[PDB]
Each structure stands twice: as structure tokens, then as C-alpha cells.
Amino acid sequence: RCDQLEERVSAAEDEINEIKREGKFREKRIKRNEQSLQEIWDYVKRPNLRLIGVPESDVENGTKLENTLQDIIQENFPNLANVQIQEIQRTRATPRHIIVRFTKVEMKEKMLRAAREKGRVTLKGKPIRLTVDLSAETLQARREWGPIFNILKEKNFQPRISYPAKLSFISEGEIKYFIDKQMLRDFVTTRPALKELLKEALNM
Amino acid sequence: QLEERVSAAEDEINEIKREGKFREKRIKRNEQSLQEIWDYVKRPNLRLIGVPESDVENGTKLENTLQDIIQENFPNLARQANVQIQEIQRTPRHIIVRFTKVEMKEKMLRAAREKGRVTLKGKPIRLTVDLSAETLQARREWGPIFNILKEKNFQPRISYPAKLSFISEGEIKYFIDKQMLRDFVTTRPALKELLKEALNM
Amino acid sequence: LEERVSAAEDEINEIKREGKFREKRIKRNEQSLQEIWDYVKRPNLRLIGVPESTKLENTLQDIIQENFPNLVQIQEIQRTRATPRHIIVRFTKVEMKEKMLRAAREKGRVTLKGKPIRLTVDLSAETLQARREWGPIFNILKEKNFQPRISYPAKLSFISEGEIKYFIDKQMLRDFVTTRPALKELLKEALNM
Ligand SMILES: [Cl-]
Ligand SMILES: [Cl-]
């Protein structure tokens, strides 16, 4: 009995190690799928702008929303007649975001540009906001660049966040781009000045 | 010493069960997110079902056929401005029509639903929303129930995987099986009268 | 302790079974990701070897004028080191991508300011790999003047009996040669049959 039982234990331990290993390779594929989903949501949303702070209106259909979109243009960047939209719609004191899906990505990029060169954008004198529309995960990665961004800003590096969630800044007469925080760590680990500045923020 | 090895094995087993449940939740999230992005990408599209196909076709022949369907079934819809198509192609195979504006896809779908019986040269065809296989299958699992609700303004939605929800009494309700829906409607005369035939009641 | 080991074995068996069910859904998801990436990228063409500097759209028209006499709506054109990045041209109609690719494959050489560049498809990783894997079979069929072609997503087509036949994958082609002996003899080893 002690023989049949010891052999039953050994087999089980071996099946356990097999399971842990299959688990690791399964984990790797799920992660790869999660990253691929984030990327495709980002890709498919590229033609999209989020309009934030625009007052709700009664029986507000697509024609009304385009008309409002044109009022925003006239008030902030007049020369930016009719711009091409695949779709536009809202997503209770606080008005819902409007998601504007352009026919051509170039139109989305030109309106973003004009908005970031203008600083304050307004509809009838009150501040509205224009931003990109991204997967939840990328949106979060941008937010988490927050602390590092502010440090770089404070210390004259001219930071930017761009698509998808890349931080960029100047380092040696040149714009450097960092796709994620690990690619930044591997860059600062070489520059001492930058390293002591970002050490805590990079959780290095 | 056996007892030691058994304890150790039981502990490793508990760790694997939890890891496994963690992975299962993420696999489910990924499945749901795939259903959503398929639905999202197909928003500008309609499926045109039952259209006779030819030995060889291209975009131009198919677009002239869409024009015939419009002229034959809802001409006024195209009176003031032409229907803007971005592209049209086969997957008699389904034809996928991709509109420039989602607004136009919606206008045409509505005219089809309000005409009832859409034909091409006298023969019945169908215009329908284009969706992920999952969402389509979910809507068929609910059958006519889903469409009666749509047609009476109840805002029905599929939620992953195949749950039905809609709004009644100013509250969103979710249903997993038809049985749950039956239980719910036995108390609502307005809603009961509408869905009885459809819930096999 | 026998009860405890029997129970552990039951747990292990449940974990393995529940693991294969999970594994099949991971596979399902991987395949579904392949298909949605192919679908979304279907009107895309990739430009390789174009030097770095509306300008991109201008460059596209430049390439078109310089190379393809007969031959244009775009949804997006964008760049993806010393080597210039690829340019992804996202056409409005899949048909335009196809015509650009045909004209490139026919002209056999494509140039910008007289320097050779490459036009190619832009598809999921899995599908690009599937195309590359038709290589050995494509090469053989080309040699024997079967006029083979690889097209969307990863289908092989070629002339058999004056008629073009299409193969979604290698299994479909194996099934096809089970009843054509000379063709089977030709592709037997390439098909790992
Ligand atoms: Cl997964
Ligand atoms: Cl697992």
C-alpha cells in the first residue's frame, strides 16, 4: 500500500509541475491577446475626437450635432463650409462627451492641432475641451505618465504625450519617444542627471 | 514524510485554482471585448441578403443594384441627395454595404423596416444590421421578442454574452433566460400583452 | 492520508480539464483577433523604402504619377533609426488597394524620384506568416508555370485545367491533390503529406 500510495503522490507532483508550466504559457497568450485588443481599439478609434463640456440640447440629432460642430469651428478656428463625418453622437448636471468620428483621420488631426495651438477653446465664451478617443487601457497609460510628465515639464524637457500613449521629450538636441515606462527606465539608466530626477517616479 | 509531500501538494493546488480563475475572468473579458469591437467596426454597414449573384461581379455592378433596390422600395429616401456608399461587396452570398455616414445606414434600415417587404425585381430580399457572429446569435436566441421590444421603443440591448436587457418603468432590467422574462412580465399587463405570443405564453 | 491524495487527484483532474476548456477559448480569441485585424487592415497598402522629410498624400500621388500611367480616395496615410519607417496607406475602398498592388506586380519595379521602393500588403501577423509559409509551394508552382498568386487573406490560387482554383490554407490544397496524381507528386514533400 505504501508503494502504491507513494507512487500516487509522485505522479500527482509531476502532474502539478506540468500544470504550472501550462499555466505560464497560457498566461503569456492571454496577455498577448489583451495587448492586441488594446491596440486594435486604439487603431479603430484613430479617426475620433472627444468634445467635452458642450451643453445638451433638445431633440439633439446628428444634424444638430454637426451644426454645433460647425459653431465650434467658426468660434475657434474659422478657416480650419462642411467637414466630413462618418458619425457623431453623445456617449446629468454634467453634459455627456460628444464623440465625433471623422471620415478622414487628417481632419481629426488638424482639429486637434488647431485646438492645442489655441489653448482655450470655447463655445459661446465658456470652455469646452477637445481630446483624443482611445481604449480604456491606453487612456489609463496616459494618465499614469502624469507624475513623470510634470517633473519633465518642471525641469525644462518639453514633454508631450501622443498616440497611443507615448511620452516624448528633448534630450540631446533631439526628440526622444518612449512607448511605455520600461523603455524610459532603460534610457535614463544611462543618463545620471535624468536618473536622479526620475528615479522615484519610475519606481526604479 | 509522505504527509509532508501531500500538504505541499494541496497548497500548490490551491494556488493554481486561484490563478486559473484569474485567467478565466480575463479570457471572458477578452471574448466580450472582441464581440464589442466587431459590433463597433460594423456600425456603418448593412447586410443585404438574398440578392442573386453573377458569375463575375465588381463594386460598380453591386452599387447599381443597391440603386435599383432604393428606387424599387424607398425612392424618396434618395430624392434630395444621393446615398453615399464607401464600399459594397460580397462576404447567394450576403452583400455588405458600407455607408459613408452611419446616419444614412440608420435611415435606410428604418425605411426597410417600415416598408415591411423589400423586393428586388419582385423577389423578397432582406436588409439588416451587420453584427458580430456572437451578437447576431444572441439576437436570434431571443427571436421575435427582441424585435417587438425594438419596435415598441423599449431600447433592447444584448449584453455579453447573450443577456437581454431593456428599460421598463424607467429601470434597466437584465434577463439570462426566457423563463426569467416570463416571470417578470406576468405582472405587467402592458408588457404582457405585447410579448405573450412571443414567449410562447 | 489516502483520502487526501484521492481528493488531490480529483482536484488535479478538475484543473486539467478546466484548463483545456480555457485553452480552447484562448485559441478562439487568438483566431478572432487574426480575423478582425485582417478585416480592419484590408484596405491598407504598405510603402517601404520612402525617405523621411498632406506631404505624405502628395508623395503618394507622386508615386502614382511616376509609375502607373492608367491610374484615389484615402482614409489615412501615416508613418509607422537610419531606415525610414514604412508608410501605411489606408484607402477608402479595398478595390483601390487591389489596383495599386496589381499595377505594382505588373510593372515589376516601382520607383520614387527614380529610387526603387516596395508596395506590399498590411495584414495581421498570423496572416502575413501564413502567406510567407506558402513560399515553398508558390515557388514550385511558379517554376512549373502554374501562374500562382497569393491574395487576401492568405489564399493561394493557380491555373489548373484552364480554371483558377483557390486554396484557403494548406489543408485545402492537400485535399485537392488527393485526386490529382501529377500535382500530388509535385507538391507531396512541400505539403508534408
Ligand atoms: Cl484570451
Ligand atoms: Cl488555465
Identify each DSSP E strand in C39-114 by its residue range: 44-48, 74-79, 87-91, 110-112
Which experiment gave this structure?
X-ray
CATH number at residue B149: 3.30.250.20
C55 & C118 share domain: yes
A109 & A178 share domain: no
Task: End-to-end CA distance of chain B: give it in Å, rounded.
Answer: 65
Cα A23 versus chain centre, distance? 30
Cβ proximity of A147 and A203 under 8 Å: no
User: What's the CA gap between C96 and C60, in Å, rounded?
Assistant: 13
Residues, CB-to-ion distance under 5 Å, ligand 1: A 30, 33; B 27, 30; C 26, 29
Task: End-to-end CA distance of chain C: give it in Å, rounded.
Answer: 51
| CA B31 to centroid of ligand 1, rounded, Å | 7
| B157: nearest Cα among B149, B166, B144, B167 | B166
User: What's the CA gap between C75 and A149, in Å, rounded?
Assistant: 32
| B37: nearest Cα among B104, B128, B146, B135 | B135
| DSSP helix, strand, coil percent of chain B (3-state; round to 5) | 55, 20, 25
User: What's the CA gap between C177 and C187, in Å, rounded?
Assistant: 8
CATH number at residue B118: 3.30.70.1820
User: What's the CA gap between C99 and C111, in Å, rounded?
Assistant: 17
A23 & A93 share domain: no
B124 & B142 share domain: no
Min distance C58 CA to chain B CA atoms (Å)? 22
C148 & C108 share domain: no
- φ, ψ at A12 (rounded to 5°): -65, -40
The set of cell numbers assigned to A98 is 460628444
**Residue C182 in contact with partner chain A when CB distance is under 8 A:** no
Residue numbers of the domain that contains A52: 45-133
In 3-state terms, what secondary structure has residue B87?
strand
C111 & C163 share domain: no
Sheet holding A121-123, edge to edge: A85-90, A98-102, A48-52, A126-132, A121-123
C48 & C35 share domain: no
Collect all residues of chain C within an 8 Å Cβ-Cβ radius of residue A33: 26, 29-30, 33
- Domain endpoint, select from C102, C122, C142: C122
| CA C38 to centroid of ligand 1, rounded, Å | 18
A115 & A87 share domain: yes
Angle at A175 between CA A172 and CA A180, to 5 degrees: 115
Collect all residues of chain B within an 8 Å Cβ-Cβ radius of residue A87: 43-44, 101-103
B143 & B179 share domain: yes
| C91: nearest Cα among C128, C127, C64, C65 | C64
Environment class of A160 (CB within 10 Å of its CB; exposed 0-12, middle 13-18, buried 19+):
middle
C133 & C165 share domain: yes
B144 & B191 share domain: yes
CATH number at residue B10: 1.20.5.390
Cβ proximity of C92 and C84 under 8 Å: no
- Cβ within 8 Å, pair C36-A33: no
B190 & B148 share domain: yes
- Domain endpoint, select from C122, C143, C159: C122
Chains that touch B (3 or more CB pairs under 8 A): A, C
Say whether the peptide bond before residue A159 is cis (omega within 30 degrees of 0).
no
- Number of structural domains in chain C: 3
